Amino acid sequence: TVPQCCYGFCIDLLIKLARTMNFTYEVHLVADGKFGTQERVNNSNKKEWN
Amino acid sequence: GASIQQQATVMLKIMQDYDWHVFSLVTTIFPGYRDFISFIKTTVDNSFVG
Numbered sequence A: 001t002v003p004q005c006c007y008g009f010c011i012d013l014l015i016k017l018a019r020t021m022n023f024t025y026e027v028h029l030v031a032d033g034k035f036g037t038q039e040r041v042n043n044s045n046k047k048e049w050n
Numbered sequence B: 001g002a003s004i005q006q007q008a009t010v011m012l013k014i015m016q017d018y019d020w021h022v023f024s025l026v027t028t029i030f031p032g033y034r035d036f037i038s039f040i041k042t043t044v045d046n047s048f049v050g
């Protein structure tokens, strides 16, 4: 992992949310470049989210 | 011997191989029915068969 810097539409929306609803954030990118689907795992013949 | 879980797995394989995907579970208060129902539900939920 390397610390890069992110910005854009979603980051501005998140900053506005943190301003309105008083909380602090720690942003990190998802390990793989996948949004997420229910995929079959090759162990136990199960389905899981990635 | 075979535990009730393995017998349930074989029964589900039987139902799958003959395309009997619609079924009902009828049990009494006989001991071991809790584990039987739990295993059947767990196998059904973590399955892509439908």
Ligand SMILES: *[C@@H]1O[C@H](CO)[C@@H](O[C@@H]2O[C@H](CO)[C@@H](O)[C@H](O)[C@H]2NC(C)=O)[C@H](O)[C@H]1NC(C)=O
Residues within 6 Å of the ligand: A022
């Ligand atoms: C808004 O954020 C401020 C941070 O400045 C919160 O103030 C903190 O309040 C907590 C308890 O709620 C204290 O433990 C901290 O010492 C406070 N920090 C400072 C320096 O103010 C405030 O609570 C937040 N507003 C809310 C969520 O009520």
Ligand SMILES: *[C@@H]1O[C@H](CO)[C@@H](O)[C@H](O)[C@H]1NC(C)=O
Residues within 6 Å of the ligand: A041, A042, A043
């Ligand atoms: C099989 O699954 C393991 C983890 O369960 C994964 O690391 C591996 O890449 C998989 N093999 C494939 C997708 O060919």
